[model samples]
Target chain A: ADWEAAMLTLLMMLKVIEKADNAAQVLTALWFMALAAHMAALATPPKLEDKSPASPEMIDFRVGFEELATEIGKAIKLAALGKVKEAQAAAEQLKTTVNAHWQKYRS
Target chain B: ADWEAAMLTLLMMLKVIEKADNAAQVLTALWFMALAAHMAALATPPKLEDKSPASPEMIDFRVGFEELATEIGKAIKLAALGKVKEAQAAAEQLKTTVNAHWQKYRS
Candidate 1:
């Protein structure tokens, strides 16, 4: 499998996890998200400089990652408060945000 | 709709272009790769500071991008020289290299 395959898997897996309706699915989704973040941290950059500050792209990339994290985190909270649509709206926004960014990057 | 979708499309498209035994397919593939490079260059980082040097990850990412370009370029050349298998091998190496890198990055 190629990196493309893995990337698509993660992207789609997110939707499944987020749209989960039942309690079982919701709990499972939260765990999955946590695991996903942990997995992302597995890679040790070849050059890990204590003095090396995070560069712009790195910061931007982190912000992008945080965007997803915050949205997902908020989705869970909103869903619990009986605001399912509200949660989904955030998810929708995230989808749009990511699509726009990727298109710009890939353009 | 997402970046992941676009990525997978290009990855598969490259395969089709490479395995294409006819001259037309080969020509098409070369043109396609050229367009892909152009698309990547379209993104103008907001901070275009001459003093702002490239970050490590950005540099690493570019290197990975270059690796693919060089491999694909070589593949085109090797195919013309009656070294189809050699070209394919290079392609295979690139797939593996990228997968490994993305895994680390995503990890």
Candidate 2:
């Protein structure tokens, strides 16, 4: 299955967060980052178009993506409530999370 | 058809371009903008899953999306070749283009 769009979207969000000049911008980037992770989680069925069974690797990757999405969502809610510092900390952790899990699948 | 994802991605790209501090960032944003537009153009088959005929509005929207994507691609190539002003000019026009066309379909 194609994963390039999901990866590029996440990378774009990372760059957006890095250059954010205001709280709104940070929240926007975090929302989109969460969306990318959510989409990745939902797209992880092995050979989905072929009606194939889920593989172990696919299951693990989906779980990681789901967790990543959940964490980003948590950050988004925190930011919405004005907890900027805590939200930023959570957002920053996304880089490490993606880097660790993406290596196994990104070519 | 589902269009929120495409619209949100385009909005995100617009924010990225508005906040970009360097050429690399601008290029990345522009590329993703083009991709979003391209995906929108491709997704305009009017109830594709139902095998329905394309309506006039759908046809027009698809054409506009295709043109928008092409223009963004052109801007990306120009930016790559160091025509910063021209590329920025092209990128800025995207806001007007999306606004004019998207109101018809965006809810």
Candidate 3:
């Protein structure tokens, strides 16, 4: 199981590295992540406290979550470079971009 | 390879179906895809023409692409239910949401 987790971590990095290793792998990895995220958001195993595996309350809504992880990966990938400081600055961006989206999409 | 591709396609659907079979898998799938898209966008073989395996010319920028596919999948996932017209309407929203983001993030 640790091996599987390691592979997954590598795979996620590989997604980003595959984008640089890296960007290509990044797509494959992010594709995997976003697909899972929505499934999670939509009524699944990993959950929302107020709800059980209730049917998705929203019948129709449209927004993409892939970019969020993409950006997150990009930040880490960039940080993995010696420019650790810049990546930290970039990391705050994770907050900036994310907030910007929920304002536009969720509310 | 065909089998791998089939498994991948299944994995993609399973991402979404795995979101509802279906949704969790959708995140896993999109996570994979977005990671790949940037690599393609960035200076990879999937190409921007006038470029070689050129290093990323842009040092910094931020936006997320995962939602783009998630919504696209959602449109189809809904369509699969055979509620053709409503799903069609949802599909149009895909266009709406995507355009909204690029205008916000890219441009």
**Per-candidate TM-score against the hidden true structure:** 0.36, 0.51, 0.27
Share of true Cα-Cα contacts across chains kept by each model: 0.00, 0.00, 0.18
DockQ for each model: 0.01, 0.10, 0.08
Between candidates 1 and 3, the one scoring higher on lDDT is 1
Candidate 2 versus the native: TM-score? Answer: 0.51
Model 1's CAPRI class? incorrect
Ranking by TM-score: 2, 1, 3
For residues B8-95, write the lDDT of model 3, one tens digit per residue.
3433443343323332233343334333333433321112233333334322111234455456455544433344455445545654
Candidate 1: where are CA atoms >4 Å away? A1-107, B1-6, B17-19, B23-27, B41-53, B101-107
lDDT (tens digit, per residue) of candidate 1 on A1-107:
22223234446755875666753244234334433543453222223322234776545545665565455445444443445556556556656654554443331
RMSD of each: 17.0, 7.9, 16.9
lDDT string, candidate 2, B1-107, tens digits: 24657767877787777777765577667766755664565564323334334766556666777677666656665555556666677778877776666665665
Candidate ordering by lDDT (highest first): 2, 1, 3
- Which parts of model 2 are misplaced by more than 4 Å? A18-21, A38-53, B1-107
DockQ ranking of the models: 2, 3, 1
Q: Best by DockQ, which number?
A: 2
> Candidate 2 chain A: worst 10 consecutive residues by lDDT?
A44-53
lDDT of each: 0.47, 0.64, 0.39
